[PDB]
Coordinates of all heavy atoms in Angstrom, one line a residue:
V1 N -60.2 -162.9 -82.8 CA -59.9 -163.1 -81.4 C -58.4 -163.0 -81.2 O -57.6 -163.8 -81.8 CB -60.4 -164.5 -80.9 CG1 -59.9 -164.8 -79.5 CG2 -61.9 -164.6 -81.0
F2 N -58.0 -162.0 -80.5 CA -56.6 -161.7 -80.3 C -56.2 -162.1 -78.8 O -57.0 -162.1 -77.9 CB -56.2 -160.2 -80.5 CG -56.8 -159.7 -81.7 CD1 -58.0 -159.0 -81.8 CD2 -56.1 -159.8 -82.9 CE1 -58.5 -158.4 -82.9 CE2 -56.6 -159.3 -84.1 CZ -57.8 -158.6 -84.1
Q3 N -54.9 -162.5 -78.7 CA -54.4 -162.8 -77.3 C -53.4 -161.8 -76.9 O -52.4 -161.5 -77.7 CB -53.7 -164.2 -77.4 CG -54.7 -165.4 -77.5 CD -55.1 -165.6 -79.0 OE1 -54.6 -165.0 -79.9 NE2 -56.1 -166.4 -79.2
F4 N -53.5 -161.2 -75.7 CA -52.6 -160.2 -75.2 C -51.9 -160.7 -74.0 O -52.4 -161.4 -73.1 CB -53.4 -158.9 -74.8 CG -54.1 -158.3 -76.0 CD1 -55.4 -157.7 -75.8 CD2 -53.5 -158.2 -77.2 CE1 -56.0 -157.1 -76.9 CE2 -54.1 -157.6 -78.3 CZ -55.4 -157.0 -78.1
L5 N -50.5 -160.5 -74.0 CA -49.7 -161.0 -73.0 C -49.9 -160.3 -71.6 O -49.9 -160.9 -70.6 CB -48.2 -161.0 -73.4 CG -47.2 -161.4 -72.4 CD1 -47.4 -162.9 -72.1 CD2 -45.8 -161.2 -73.0
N6 N -50.0 -159.0 -71.7 CA -50.2 -158.2 -70.5 C -50.8 -156.9 -70.9 O -51.1 -156.6 -72.0 CB -48.9 -158.0 -69.7 CG -47.7 -157.6 -70.7 OD1 -47.9 -157.2 -71.8 ND2 -46.5 -157.8 -70.2
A7 N -51.1 -156.0 -69.9 CA -51.8 -154.7 -70.1 C -50.9 -153.8 -70.9 O -51.5 -153.0 -71.6 CB -52.1 -154.1 -68.7
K8 N -49.6 -153.9 -71.0 CA -48.8 -153.1 -71.8 C -49.2 -153.3 -73.3 O -49.6 -152.4 -74.0 CB -47.3 -153.3 -71.6 CG -46.4 -152.6 -72.6 CD -45.0 -152.7 -72.2 CE -44.5 -154.1 -72.2 NZ -43.0 -154.3 -71.9
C9 N -49.1 -154.5 -73.8 CA -49.5 -154.9 -75.1 C -51.0 -154.7 -75.3 O -51.3 -154.3 -76.5 CB -49.1 -156.3 -75.4 SG -47.4 -156.8 -74.9
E10 N -51.8 -154.9 -74.3 CA -53.2 -154.7 -74.5 C -53.5 -153.2 -74.8 O -54.2 -152.9 -75.8 CB -54.0 -155.0 -73.2 CG -55.4 -155.3 -73.4 CD -56.2 -155.3 -72.1 OE1 -55.9 -154.4 -71.2 OE2 -57.1 -156.1 -71.9
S11 N -52.9 -152.3 -74.1 CA -53.1 -150.9 -74.3 C -52.4 -150.5 -75.7 O -53.0 -149.6 -76.4 CB -52.5 -150.0 -73.2 OG -52.7 -148.6 -73.5
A12 N -51.3 -151.0 -76.0 CA -50.6 -150.7 -77.2 C -51.4 -151.2 -78.4 O -51.4 -150.5 -79.5 CB -49.2 -151.4 -77.3
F13 N -52.2 -152.3 -78.3 CA -53.1 -152.7 -79.4 C -54.4 -151.9 -79.4 O -54.9 -151.5 -80.5 CB -53.4 -154.2 -79.2 CG -54.1 -154.8 -80.4 CD1 -53.4 -155.4 -81.4 CD2 -55.5 -154.7 -80.5 CE1 -54.0 -155.9 -82.5 CE2 -56.1 -155.2 -81.6 CZ -55.4 -155.9 -82.6
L14 N -54.9 -151.5 -78.3 CA -56.1 -150.7 -78.2 C -56.0 -149.3 -78.7 O -56.9 -148.7 -79.2 CB -56.7 -150.8 -76.8 CG -57.2 -152.1 -76.3 CD1 -57.6 -152.0 -74.9 CD2 -58.4 -152.6 -77.2
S15 N -54.8 -148.7 -78.5 CA -54.5 -147.4 -78.9 C -53.8 -147.3 -80.3 O -53.3 -146.3 -80.7 CB -53.5 -146.7 -77.9 OG -52.5 -147.6 -77.5
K16 N -53.9 -148.5 -81.1 CA -53.5 -148.5 -82.5 C -52.0 -148.2 -82.6 O -51.6 -147.2 -83.3 CB -54.3 -147.6 -83.4 CG -55.8 -148.0 -83.4 CD -56.6 -147.2 -84.3 CE -58.1 -147.6 -84.4 NZ -58.8 -146.8 -85.4
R17 N -51.1 -148.9 -81.9 CA -49.7 -148.8 -82.1 C -49.2 -149.9 -83.0 O -49.7 -151.0 -83.0 CB -49.0 -148.8 -80.8 CG -48.8 -147.5 -80.1 CD -49.9 -147.1 -79.2 NE -49.7 -145.9 -78.5 CZ -50.1 -144.7 -78.8 NH1 -50.8 -144.6 -79.9 NH2 -49.8 -143.6 -78.1
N18 N -48.2 -149.6 -83.8 CA -47.7 -150.6 -84.8 C -46.7 -151.5 -84.1 O -45.7 -151.1 -83.6 CB -47.1 -149.8 -86.0 CG -47.0 -150.7 -87.2 OD1 -46.9 -151.9 -87.2 ND2 -47.1 -150.0 -88.4
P19 N -47.0 -152.8 -84.1 CA -46.0 -153.8 -83.6 C -44.7 -153.8 -84.3 O -43.7 -154.1 -83.7 CB -46.7 -155.1 -83.7 CG -48.2 -154.8 -83.9 CD -48.2 -153.5 -84.6
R20 N -44.7 -153.5 -85.6 CA -43.5 -153.4 -86.4 C -42.7 -152.1 -86.0 O -41.4 -152.2 -86.2 CB -43.8 -153.4 -87.9 CG -44.7 -154.6 -88.3 CD -45.2 -154.4 -89.7 NE -45.9 -155.6 -90.2 CZ -47.2 -155.8 -89.9 NH1 -47.9 -155.0 -89.3 NH2 -47.8 -157.0 -90.4
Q21 N -43.3 -151.1 -85.6 CA -42.6 -149.9 -85.2 C -42.2 -149.9 -83.8 O -41.2 -149.3 -83.4 CB -43.5 -148.6 -85.4 CG -43.7 -148.3 -86.9 CD -44.6 -147.1 -87.1 OE1 -45.3 -146.7 -86.2 NE2 -44.7 -146.5 -88.3
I22 N -42.9 -150.6 -82.9 CA -42.5 -150.8 -81.5 C -41.2 -151.8 -81.5 O -41.2 -152.8 -82.2 CB -43.6 -151.4 -80.7 CG1 -44.8 -150.4 -80.6 CG2 -43.1 -151.7 -79.3 CD1 -44.4 -149.1 -80.1
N23 N -40.2 -151.3 -80.8 CA -38.9 -152.0 -81.0 C -38.8 -153.4 -80.3 O -38.3 -154.3 -81.0 CB -37.8 -151.1 -80.4 CG -37.7 -149.8 -81.1 OD1 -38.1 -148.7 -80.6 ND2 -37.1 -149.8 -82.4
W24 N -39.3 -153.5 -79.1 CA -39.1 -154.7 -78.4 C -40.0 -155.9 -78.8 O -39.9 -157.0 -78.2 CB -39.4 -154.5 -76.9 CG -40.6 -153.7 -76.6 CD1 -40.8 -152.4 -76.4 CD2 -41.9 -154.3 -76.4 NE1 -42.1 -152.1 -76.1 CE2 -42.8 -153.3 -76.1 CE3 -42.4 -155.6 -76.4 CZ2 -44.2 -153.5 -75.9 CZ3 -43.8 -155.8 -76.2 CH2 -44.6 -154.8 -76.0
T25 N -40.9 -155.7 -79.8 CA -41.7 -156.8 -80.3 C -40.9 -157.7 -81.2 O -39.8 -157.4 -81.6 CB -42.9 -156.3 -81.0 OG1 -42.5 -155.9 -82.4 CG2 -43.5 -155.1 -80.3
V26 N -41.4 -158.9 -81.5 CA -40.7 -159.8 -82.3 C -40.9 -159.5 -83.8 O -40.1 -159.8 -84.6 CB -41.3 -161.3 -82.1 CG1 -42.6 -161.5 -82.7 CG2 -40.3 -162.3 -82.6
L27 N -42.0 -158.7 -84.1 CA -42.1 -158.3 -85.5 C -41.0 -157.3 -86.0 O -40.5 -157.4 -87.1 CB -43.5 -157.6 -85.7 CG -44.7 -158.6 -86.1 CD1 -44.4 -159.2 -87.5 CD2 -45.0 -159.6 -85.0
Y28 N -40.7 -156.4 -85.1 CA -39.6 -155.4 -85.4 C -38.3 -156.2 -85.6 O -37.5 -155.9 -86.6 CB -39.5 -154.4 -84.3 CG -38.3 -153.5 -84.5 CD1 -38.4 -152.3 -85.2 CD2 -37.1 -153.7 -83.8 CE1 -37.4 -151.4 -85.4 CE2 -36.0 -152.8 -84.0 CZ -36.2 -151.7 -84.7 OH -35.1 -150.8 -84.9
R29 N -38.0 -157.2 -84.8 CA -36.8 -157.9 -84.9 C -36.8 -158.8 -86.2 O -35.7 -158.9 -86.8 CB -36.5 -158.8 -83.7 CG -36.6 -158.1 -82.4 CD -36.1 -158.9 -81.2 NE -34.7 -159.3 -81.4 CZ -33.7 -158.6 -81.0 NH1 -33.9 -157.4 -80.4 NH2 -32.5 -159.0 -81.1
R30 N -37.9 -159.4 -86.5 CA -38.0 -160.1 -87.8 C -37.9 -159.3 -89.0 O -37.4 -159.7 -90.0 CB -39.3 -161.0 -87.8 CG -39.3 -162.2 -87.0 CD -40.6 -163.0 -87.1 NE -40.8 -163.3 -88.5 CZ -41.9 -163.9 -88.9 NH1 -42.9 -164.3 -88.1 NH2 -42.1 -164.1 -90.2
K31 N -38.4 -158.0 -88.9 CA -38.3 -157.1 -90.1 C -36.9 -156.5 -90.2 O -36.5 -156.1 -91.3 CB -39.3 -156.0 -90.0 CG -40.7 -156.5 -90.4 CD -41.7 -155.4 -90.3 CE -41.3 -154.2 -91.1 NZ -41.3 -154.5 -92.6

C-alpha cells in the first residue's frame, strides 16, 4: 500500500520513474 501526494507523483510512480533520479524528491537530496 503506497501513499501518493498528488497526481504528479502518482503518474511518476505508475510510469516507473526512479525517485532517486528525480531531482525534487527527498531521496535524491538524501543521496
Side-chain angles (χ1 to χ4, degrees):
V1 175
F2 312 97
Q3 291 81 10
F4 297 140
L5 177 61
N6 43 17
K8 175 173 63 178
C9 317
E10 200 196 40
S11 180
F13 190 94
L14 293 173
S15 42
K16 299 184 179 184
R17 271 90 173 97
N18 203 327
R20 307 168 173 86
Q21 291 178 345
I22 299 300
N23 296 108
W24 49 265
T25 78
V26 77
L27 269 300
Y28 176 85
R29 307 189 63 85
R30 281 185 54 185
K31 281 180 58 64

